[PDB]
Design a protein around this ligand. Structure first.
Ligand code: BCO
Ligand code: BCO
Ligand code: BCO
Ligand code: BCO
Ligand code: BCO
Ligand code: BCO
Ligand code: BCO
Ligand code: BCO
Lengths: 162, 163, 163, 162, 162, 166, 163, 163
């Protein structure tokens, strides 16, 4: 069906706001350990944005992120594809658009914390455990999950990702 | 008594508020005898300072005055006090827990403060540690230094309800 | 005689202020003979630069020229001078103490300046130190670097009165 | 014909500046044929990028595209080119010299650039070294990283104007 | 690949800005004998419009044209498809949308100058060397080119072109 | 029955009211039916073009005919675009009354020339309305302004402004 | 008798100008009885038309109705009349000179007119020729070719003082 | 000295321009004596006209008075003069060159003029020709065909820089 990618957020529109509830639902459901209250407060925060994957008008997931352009990196907050649509390449297409978007916006480092269950998806998206950004650049901006691995992805502004 | 919490401050944009701030400055000044009253009033009434108030029957009986540094990613704890005949009751801990809840909702997860030897044990029980994860390059020159006091730090878990 | 202090500047000037700046530019130039006159003019009349003028009987006799960097949490001292025949009467010190008082009230508590062989002993007596506590990462792209002079720092105690 | 120097940039209504930025983008993309044209064009027209432009008789013959990082105490040097038919005329040296002049007025005393094998000789001659005195924690994540090329620094001498 | 057509221009918007730069590049590169500045002056001239061919976000061709409603014709100014995309039909489709646009705006005559390497393309778009529009109507409005061949195309507003 | 002539059109500055708009649809229907080799999408585009106008023949409220035209007052002539009388009203002289009302309208607007293209099934009507195959307006004046039709005869009509046409 | 020349017309209004435009309509009609006075009134009152009026001692005694086609670079002479009791006094010629002068000052240098047989001598004397320099494509269908009427042209010299 | 080029013209307005226009009227008038001064002044101060003024140290030493007919696709060259003691230094050629650059910017790529016998060699060195590409229907009447003058044409190339 018609697949479409939109970067959306709760600015400073009905279809957008309902897409955001759709996203908040998909993060909660694929990310059980994340409290629903705190997924919601982040998804609906202005300083956060989300790349929404829309299959035929209906949200089937996306990537919630927080650009820190004073720092040169972007945090990756939530990632989920709905369970009946996983292992269809949908998550890689999501990351790649996310890369393209950040290319155009001169930001070329991703940082994220990964669980042991999900680390292999980030490895397969180019992420690495070798964190070249100085600790002093991110501590107190990215939400430390202690007991999860910090990972990093460097974007090349000269490859087309999409 | 009826207990209220309220975050307040001299916005550079109310009367119940104005006297609440006067009660805080009085409370802070009386519980912190080595803080110049003039200095206390200058910070409580500064606009980039906010103050969590604790109110028992309309009457200001404690609070945490604090300074949000959202660009630097932390908050400074300016004053803490519970008035004398309301101490040792758990009020201080309900203030700190509230103040934590606020700061999660505003996506700040670090408290920096300075502690003399008589307040270190208090902050320790609010979960403050001497080990400072925040880089000096980020707080020095923004937080009021206190040579002679232990700097302390608190990291918040936004997965968690404090109140 | 009748002395007064005023923190004047050039935003977007009175006749009274315009000539005061010109007076301040003259005093700065005369007491700093190897500073190009125009460079002094371009900073005294700069909008982001302010000046604490020292007036005696209506006439400019001294001043300190400074640039506040509240986003970086320090102020840059630019020019300091007392006219020839008013020196060594303490005018120098009260000019600093007034600037320290002004800066407590704006919660900037760090001065940074460069001092050549002809002024470091002045700055030593105003509490300046060669030990720079401010991060190099915080001022390098901001303050003019007078290579060949000694970078020096003053930290302010916002709890004591300076005047 | 008369020679001009002008530091221009994208901002927020001048036909002249606009066709000079296209002139620049063209000369950059011609002398850097292994860069994406879209990358050069997205940077030249970026408003946190500036470009020193070198004019001979109304049309662009050269320029230096750069990115000032005052809160880091240096400037990233992004693109350097003089057109073919005007090279080996000391033209690229006056560009680097006006750029130093401009930057000493603005209290930036460090240049950071990457240089491959075709360019490293020229930057050595304008005074750049491989000895990077800027801490890795001041520049990493701010300057466009180029694995494979060599990071070069140039340190400027401060000056009291007039 | 997601194909798009957009009739754009420089009214007196960044996406559109970078697109005109894309267009000015493609023109300049498929038309080496055209001054790069000259192409730039006409593409960024407000009374000029370019029909862009956008393939998966990037420009891969267009037609720059000049509508002369007073005179009752339009001037074809530049046509190019990027090298690796030629002989795929893109050119013919570009003309076909451009004929479609002009039907909807009551302009039913195209005029252009073509060198020998381009006569066949315009012949295949319905262009003829027989110029029905009077010389008084076009001379000193369309830029003439000593040497090239004046070519005319007449549109049927009762036909659908796309 | 009751007969009215109205010069109407898709005025793009005042809202064409419902009465006008339903007449613009009716004329589009009539032209389409009487001119079937003309695409109906073409007819609608032109009838509703703000630079076009239409003299509507209105009988007891319903549209029974019209002459849609385009005035080129810079060029000094007018194009005749569509002519139709509905079938059950033809050969009653309605065709001619429309043309004459149209001539009388144009001499008041100081345009004294009609140009049109006619195929063999229509050349006779326009001849009876005064058109000639002999075109005094120069080619440079009309070409690429009026919709050419190859295989139609271009036909011209010159109007005398000292004459009262209706 | 006091003689005035006024270029008037029915623009986008004045009592005096209105009664004059009627006075002109009369004179033209009466002097040109074989043109429908209906048609004369239309043109005289058309706003793209103008009439230079010959006012003698208050009353309208003649004039020239003309239509400027600036985009074409010519003016059409439409009606010319002096009332009867005032003919052969040179009034026709003074009207034509004031008209020439008027057009010089508007950068229009060509007059076209279709003339009946009873008029050719008057236009000849005013410098009109039957030899027509303007191209047919510039004037056809802007001025009305009347059958049996003679097109005449007058070309004007910007450097000549006509009045 | 300081040379400037200013396209000026009456606007249907500023003392510096007005005195420049009067200066231009004198320069033209003085170099072209057998042409009515009142005609030169009418044209210079007409608003459909513009003049490319050549200023050398405050004062008018020449210019090109021209007339853009953008409906018709060309500009009319009307008066070229350089004050007598500044001639044969190239001033009139920098004048035409500037005028060509101006017109390329407005998509007017043809200049028509009626040269007198003393002017022809100048127009020839500016690229003019007696072979007129522009159809007579496009210029006739719009410009004045002075008996004895030679119609000359210049086609501008918009891909070349002229200044
Ligand atoms: C602490 C918070 C940090 C965050 O931002 S959330 C951490 C990641 N989130 C989750 O795992 C939530 C639930 N999982 C999901 O929603 C999706 O499976 C997920 C991770 C978004 C991937 O989307 P999909 O469409 O399933 O992936 P895909 O079709 O594009 O295939 C990508 C390749 O990666 C591989 N992979 C490794 N670990 C995986 C894993 N844990 N889940 C899914 N795939 C994983 C998988 O083999 C897949 O195919 P291939 O091997 O490349 O051919
Ligand atoms: C440079 C200084 C700037 C600043 O940040 S202000 C520093 C703090 N200021 C002051 O303490 C001035 C006055 N202090 C007070 O009024 C109170 O002691 C204080 C610290 C406000 C706490 O208010 P309370 O309502 O009494 O707190 P609470 O009932 O929740 O009990 C806290 C538990 O911690 C324990 N504790 C250890 N050392 C303490 C200490 N020095 N002060 C208070 N409590 C202390 C105490 O036993 C109490 O109960 P528990 O052991 O947790 O069961
Ligand atoms: C590169 C940036 C350029 C600058 O702004 S740094 C240069 C500072 N300005 C100058 O050197 C301009 C000429 N000098 C002056 O105007 C004055 O001497 C100066 C330093 C501004 C202070 O004016 P005064 O009225 O003399 O200050 P004061 O009465 O409070 O003197 C108190 C104590 O200062 C002491 N001192 C040491 N070195 C000094 C020195 N180089 N200049 C002046 N005083 C100096 C002096 O001995 C006196 O001692 P004490 O306080 O009585 O124990
Ligand atoms: C990616 C981050 C930014 C970059 O690194 S962009 C890479 C540099 N760009 C390019 O190389 C593009 C193509 N080349 C050019 O545009 C110009 O040649 C270039 C490199 C800008 C130099 O400008 P020019 O005006 O041609 O040079 P110039 O006349 O001032 O001569 C300076 C002296 O340097 C010397 N040199 C050594 N290697 C060179 C080299 N690879 N390219 C040019 N000159 C080089 C050259 O011998 C000349 O000698 P001298 O000092 O005048 O005696
Ligand atoms: C003086 C300025 C005046 C102007 O308007 S610019 C004149 C055009 N300039 C240029 O063509 C220079 C570069 N050429 C190109 O960009 C493209 O080839 C061009 C001409 C735009 C056509 O785009 P394409 O995508 O290649 O065309 P297409 O696939 O639709 O092929 C249509 C048929 O045209 C035919 N044709 C004849 N000459 C051609 C020629 N020189 N280039 C391309 N095609 C040409 C060609 O055989 C092609 O295939 P077929 O005939 O259907 O079998
Ligand atoms: C390419 C687009 C050009 C255009 O403008 S559209 C061409 C005109 N429309 C059509 O051909 C299609 C449909 N026809 C009609 O609606 C009507 O018949 C038409 C042509 C509008 C005339 O309307 P009516 O009211 O019937 O005419 P009427 O009563 O005033 O006069 C009838 C007399 O005309 C005569 N006539 C000769 N050729 C004709 C011809 N080709 N079409 C119609 N009538 C024609 C017919 O013999 C009759 O004689 P009479 O004048 O009464 O003595
Ligand atoms: C623009 C077209 C308007 C039309 O419809 S035709 C315009 C002419 N209208 C008329 O003749 C109708 C009434 N006539 C008049 O009002 C006057 O005759 C007319 C033509 C306005 C001239 O007015 P006046 O005051 O009598 O003229 P004027 O004193 O300046 O004498 C000029 C010389 O014209 C001469 N002329 C030759 N043919 C003429 C002709 N057939 N009609 C009138 N005059 C004619 C007449 O002999 C007189 O003296 P001269 O012997 O040429 O030196
Ligand atoms: C049709 C427009 C209205 C007219 O009638 S324009 C009548 C032109 N003449 C005048 O206005 C009065 C007399 N002359 C002048 O004002 C000036 O000579 C004039 C024509 C404006 C030219 O400007 P200048 O600064 O004097 O001369 P220039 O140094 O720029 O160009 C001179 C080169 O052209 C050549 N030339 C041939 N006939 C000429 C001629 N009759 N006048 C001037 N130059 C002529 C001559 O070889 C000279 O050589 P070179 O390029 O200086 O090395």
């Amino acid at each position: 069906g018609i697949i479409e990618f939109h970067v959306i957020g709760n600015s400073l529109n009905r279809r957008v706001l309902l897409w955001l509830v759709g996203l908040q639902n998909v993060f909660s459901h694929q990310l059980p350990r994340m409290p629903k209250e705190y997924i919601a407060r982040l998804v609906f925060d202005p300083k956060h944005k989300t790349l929404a994957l829309i299959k035929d008008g209906r949200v089937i997931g996306g990537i919630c992120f927080r650009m820190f352009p004073t720092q040169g990196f972007t945090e990756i907050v939530f990632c989920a594809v709905t369970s009946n649509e996983q292992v269809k390449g949908y998550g890689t297409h999501l990351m790649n658009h996310l890369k393209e978007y950040h290319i155009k916006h001169n930001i070329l480092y991703f940082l994220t914390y990964a669980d042991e269950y999900a680390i292999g998806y980030f490895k397969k998206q180019g992420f690495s455990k070798d964190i070249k950004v100085p600790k002093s650049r991110y501590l107190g901006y990215i939400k430390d999950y202690e007991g999860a691995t910090l990972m990093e992805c460097e974007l090349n502004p000269r490859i087309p990702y999409t």
